[PDB]
């Protein structure tokens, strides 16, 4: 029994990025850009008035 | 029994980034950029008034 | 029985970044950038008024 | 002079079972089943009345 | 002069079972089943009345 | 002069079971099952009445 | 700022002369001539009257 | 700021002369001539009257 | 700030001459000539009257 | 100056006999017969009356 | 100056006999017969009357 | 100056006989027969009357 109550945010999965995986007899390889990401900022605010009012209840029950 | 009550933030998983994994007889390889990320900042605020009011209850029960 | 009540922050997992894993007879390899990240700052604030008011209860019960 | 008087039972010969003999650059190979046999039972009897009356004379002669 | 008077039972010969003999650059090889056999039971009887009356004369002669 | 008067039972011969004989650059090899056999029981009887009456004369002669 | 005031003479660049780079299974390779040059003589004069009167002002300025 | 006021003479650059870089299984390799040059003579004069009158002012300035 | 006022003469750079870099299983390699140069003579004069009158002012200035 | 006055007998030259010279990924090779010759007998006589009468003069002159 | 006055007999030269010279990933090789010769008998006579009468003069002169 | 006055008999030269000279990843090699010769008998006579009458003069002169 798999129960997921709440999931959010950056969660990519099962991603494969490859270049010349089984390359044979290749010549010069230059300026290969395989960068996945640059910056990870969950809260990025400029001159912001951040006032969230949330009453949240997380209740997930597995009865057997 | 797998129960996930709350999950958030940066959590990528099962990611493979490779270059010339089984390369044979390759010539000069230059300027390969495989950087995954640069900066990890959960809270990044500039001139911000950060006033969040949250009443949150995390209650997940597994009854057997 | 796996129960996760609350998970957050930077937690990537199962990530493989490799270059020329089983390379044979390769020539000059120069300027390979495999940096994972630069800076880890959970709270990064500039001229910020940080006033969060949170009443949070973390209650997860496993009854057997 | 090759003389065979009596031959019986399980005697297979000159059998070759192979998979990917000279395989190269294969990413995944999973759940390969090359089992030759499971159980060798010459007499397997359930609720059996086994009463065979046999008189046998194995007489093979090589005269030179 | 080769003379075989009586041969029986389990006697397989000249059998070759192979997988990836000269394999190169294989990323994953999982759950390979090359089991030859499980159980060797010449007499396996359940609730059996085994009463065989046999008179056998194994007489093979090589005269030179 | 090769003379075999009586041969029986479990006697396999000249069998080769192999996996990745000359393997190179393999990342993972898991759960490889090359078991030849499990149990060797010549007489395996359950609730059996074993009463075989046999008179055997094994007489093989090489005359030179 | 790249400024070149005067450049002359023999200055070839970025030249690649190659033969059988990744050659395989070659029976014979004979009399391969890859000579780049023979003689470097800036002044080579025979029975010459060399009388050049030159006034040169090499003035190149980078103002920031 | 790169400033070159005067450059002359023999100055080749970035030259690659190669033969059978990754050669395999070659039976014979004979009389391979990869000579780059033979003689370096800046002034080579035979029965020469060398009388050059030159006034040169090499003045290159980088002002910051 | 890189400033070169005067450069001359024999100054080649970044030159790579190679033969059979990663060679394998070669039966014969004979009479390989990789000579770079033979003779370095800046002034080589035969029956020469060398009378050059030159006034040179090498003045290159870096002002910060 | 090459002078051959008398040449006779078995003298073959420059003969190449090969099988699978640069073979790759070949299966079983069996019963390869590359025998050059069996028997070398210059004089082989059976019940022979061998009576040769020869007056032979071998005179070859190289005058320089 | 090469002068050959008399040459005879078994003198083969420059003969190459090879099997799988640069073989890679070959399977079982069996019963390879590369025998050059069996028997060397210059005089082989059976019930022979060998009576050769020869007056032979070997005179080769190199005058310089 | 090379002068050969008389040459005879068994004199083969420059003969190469090889099997799997640079073999890689080969399986079982069995019953390889590379025998050069068996028996060397210059005079082999059976019931022979050997009566050769030869007056031979070997005179080769090199005059300089």
Residue numbers in the entry:
A (entry chain A), B (entry chain E), C (entry chain I), D (entry chain B), E (entry chain F), F (entry chain J), ...: 21 to 84
Sentences from the paper on this structure:
β2-microglobulin (β2m) and its truncated variant ΔΝ6 are co-deposited in amyloid fibrils in the joints, causing the disorder dialysis-related amyloidosis (DRA). We show that the aggregation of each variant in vitro results in fibrils that are polymorphic, which contain different numbers of protofilaments and different numbers of β2m subunits per layer of the amyloid fibril structure. High resolution structures, however, show that this polymorphism arises from the assembly of a common building block that is strikingly homogeneous and monomorphic.
